[PDB]
Every structure is written in structure tokens, then in C-alpha cells.
Design a protein around this ligand. Structure first.
Ligand SMILES: Nc1ncnc2c1ncn2[C@@H]1O[C@H](COP(=O)(O)OP(=O)(O)OP(=O)(O)O)[C@@H](O)[C@H]1O
Ligand SMILES: [Mg+2]
Length: 344
DNA sequence: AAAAAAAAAAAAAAAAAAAAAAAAAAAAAAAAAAAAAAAAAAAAAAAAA
């Protein structure tokens, strides 16, 4: 509602935002402002920032095609203790219109809608669930793997059609659910074992995986130096004693209100080439396969990156960053045709 | 060993008839009393050497 109303920013504030947009490291600087007390998950924070900006909302009514999913979906899969839940909790406590779910505490009707009695008018009233409450926001699903398949089947329609067609006795209707999904899962056997492929080790249906347009593998490199650095960060966090949030908030609201990035010609060609190369790279045995849904993924991420720069026009740097982020998540460089992830 | 199933199986809510319970509820007629008035019998005081 605030982004809707036109006098949210003074002119000098708009100039301040625009001057911020012109810095070379605005993407880095905005991503780093997220979760300031989480130590160097820079790419994850970039992806979450892109989720906050979102892709471009397009009207596909005349194409007779069905609504396009402009929201960005992220899976954080990694071995335990790697700060996934802290990121989901940070996002949950940051956005308006969010919901947080963990494990088996949610049922399918509890995620979509059900009928209760109004204990003040004794009328049966339909009441929404967690995925409709976070309609124009973000749903953070924690312990995504530890979630029974009856209630994850619900996520297919939400994550593709952005709608939720309940066909029950009382009323049948399509509830709109334009939520962005931020999920955290453990691998099969709740620890990456490096003798299994990515697919064998994530253990999620290829359809469900294709619905996520970033999969960050939060693997733990058995690394002395990184352990030392994170140890110092965590201990310093016990004796504690940037980019302001009041400008990050305004920057994001401005980007939502004014910027609607459109694909340019070089972006279009780069997207085509990126999709073809992505299919060749992921067509291997145990790697995460690419589908046309991943080309739509790339379009979304590129539009989000162009929204970060207040670009209002997607060109080749945005597509390059989308492809780079899609590679870095999933550790495409550290896999191989004999699928399996190396220690860097 | 876990992963879908595929039932119990419990609750809340609904119905859904029963079968019991609960809630509404002045005016019309009569009689008796106490008072009158009236026909009859009865009991008074004026008449006279
Ligand atoms: N950059 C970091 N990497 C790993 N751990 C961190 C980092 N920063 C902080 N931590 C600490 O590590 C702990 C990780 O707990 P958290 O619940 O986030 O783990 P998780 O990966 O989300 O859960 P799971 O064990 O189910 O995968 C947190 O308490 C946090 O304080
Ligand atoms: Mg956790």
C-alpha cells in the first residue's frame, strides 16, 4: 500500500536513491546489508536480495497463456548448522507479508484454506492458510525435506500457477498465491556425503526442483582458514561492543514502484545462448537438469538484477549475473561429468 | 530402514428430528347484606255518667 501511494519519497530522497544506483558495487552493497550478522554467504545474500526485488510483473492475458510467475523461488540445501534457518528467519522478520513454516507442523489444508466456526457469529467461515497469508510476500519453508509429500504437492500449483484452486463442498474458487518460496532443506541423510551426486543427495522430485529458480548448496568445506574466520565472527558476536536499513527499504520500495525492466535485444540473445549452454552443462548424469522453466528462471533473475540497478531495461550484464548466480548456486564449477562435488 | 498408502479414529461442527418442557393466562354472574316500605294485627288514650 505504501509503495502504491505516490508521495512516499521526497525529491531529495529519490535523488539519493538514484545516486546510490550509480555506484559500481550497489548490488554488492545492498546484498551485504542483508543479514549483517551472518558471515559471508555473499551469493546466497545476493539471491535473497533478488528475491526481495523480484522479477517483472507482466500482463499475459492477451497471449492466452496463463499468469507468469514473476516471483523468485530459492532452495537452500546444505549440511546442518550452516545458517539456513537464520537466513529464513531474517527474511521472515524483514518483509511485510511473510510466513514461516518448519517441517511437519503444516498440513495441506492448513497451508491453503479450511472452514471454521466464527465463535462470535456462529457462522462457518472459510479462513486462509499460510500460503495465502503470504500472498504478495515470501513464505519461508524450513525443514523442507522433512515435510510429508501430501503437503508438498500443494506447492506445485503455488510455485507455478501462483493460484490455488480449492474444489471443496462449500465453495470452489481459485485463491491467488503470488508468494515467493524460500526453503531450507537437508540432503538425504542430513549431511552432504561427497560420494553421491547432487540429485541423489538432494533427494527431491525433478519437477519440484525445477520449480526453484536458485538452489544454493550450502556445503561445508572442511577448511581450516574458513573455520578460523567464522569462529572469530561468532565469538566477536559474543562481545559485539554498513548500509542503513532506512535507505535499503526506500531503495527497494522505489524499485518496486517505478522500475519495470524490459528485455533488450542483447539480453534476449544472451538469454537464448545461456539457456542452450545451461542445458548442455546440466544434461549430465547426476547434475540438476535444466528445462525451459530454467530459462524463465534466468529471465526472472535478470529482471531482478536490472531492478537492483534501477535500470528499467535488462541488458547483458544482468543476464551475465543471472547466469553466474545460477552457476554459483549448485556449484556447477566444482562438479564434473562424473558427478560429485569436490572440495573447491 | 523410510517411504507413500490407507484405514481408525478422535473432534468439531452440522443436522435433525423427537419428546419433553415451558409459557401464556379477566371478565362475567351471583348472592348477601342491609336498607327501605307496606298490609295486618295489636296495643295504647283521648270520649261519660
Ligand atoms: N555464516 C555462517 N555459517 C554457519 N553458521 C553460522 C553462520 N553465521 C552464524 N552461524 C551460526 O550457526 C548456527 C546455525 O544454525 P541454523 O539453525 O541456522 O542451522 P541450519 O543449517 O539452518 O539448520 P539445519 O541444521 O537444520 O540444516 C546459528 O546459530 C548461527 O548462529
Ligand atoms: Mg535449521
Amino acid at each position: 500500500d505504501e509503495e502504491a501511494e505516490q508521495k512516499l519519497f521526497s525529491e531529495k530522497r529519490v535523488e539519493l536513491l538514484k545516486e546510490l544506483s550509480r555506484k559500481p558495487d550497489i548490488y554488492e552493497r545492498l546484498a551485504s546489508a542483508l543479514a549483517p550478522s551472518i558471515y559471508e554467504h555473499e551469493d546466497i545474500k545476493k539471491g535473497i536480495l533478488l528475491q526481495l526485488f523480484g522479477g517483472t510483473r507482466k500482463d499475459f492475458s492477451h497471449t492466452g497463456r496463463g499468469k507468469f510467475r514473476a516471483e523468485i523461488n530459492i532452495l537452500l540445501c546444505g549440511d546442518p548448522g550452516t545458517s539456513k534457518s537464520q537466513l529464513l528467519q531474517y527474511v521472515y522478520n524483514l518483509v511485510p507479508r511473510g510466513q514461516y513454516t518448519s517441517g511437519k507442523g503444516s498440513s495441506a489444508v492448513g497451508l491453503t484454506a479450511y472452514v471454521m466456526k466464527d465463535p462470535e457469529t456462529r457462522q462457518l467461515v472459510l479462513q486462509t492458510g499460510a500460503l495465502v497469508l503470504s500472498d504478495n510476500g515470501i513464505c519461508c519453508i524450513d525443514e523442507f525435506d522433512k515435510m510429508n509429500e501430501s503437503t508438498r504437492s500443494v506447492l506445485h500449483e503455488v510455485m507455478e500457477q501462483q493460484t490455488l484452486s480449492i474444489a471443496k463442498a462449500g465453495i470452489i474458487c481459485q485463491l491467488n498465491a503470488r508468494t515467493s518460496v524460500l526453503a531450507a532443506a537437508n540432503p538425504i541423510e542430513s549431511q552432504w556425503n561427497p560420494k553421491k551426486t547432487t540429485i541423489e543427495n538432494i533427494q527431491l522430485p525433478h519437477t519440484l526442483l525445477s520449480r526453484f529458480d536458485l538452489i544454493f548448496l550450502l556445503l561445508d568445506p572442511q577448511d581450516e582458514a574458513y573455520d578460523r574466520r567464522l569462529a572469530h565472527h561468532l565469538v566477536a558476536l559474543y562481545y559485539q561492543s554498513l548500509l542503513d536499513m532506512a535507505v535499503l527499504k526506500d531503495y527497494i520500495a522505489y524499485a518496486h514502484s517505478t522500475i519495470m525492466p524490459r528485455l533488450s535485444e542483447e539480453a534476449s540473445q544472451a538469454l537464448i545462448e545461456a539457456y542452450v549452454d545451461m542445458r548442455k552443462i546440466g544434461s549430465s548424469r547426476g547434475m540438476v537438469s535444466a528445462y525451459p522453466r530454467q530459462l524463465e528462471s534466468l529471465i526472472r533473475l535478470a529482471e531482478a538484477h536490472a531492478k537492483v540497478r534501477l535500470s528499467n531495461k535488462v541488458e547483458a550484464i544482468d543476464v551475465e549475473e543471472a547466469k553466474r548466480l545460477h552457476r554459483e548456486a549448485l556449484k556447477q564449477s566444482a562438479t564434473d561429468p562424473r558427478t560429485g562435488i569436490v572440495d573447491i
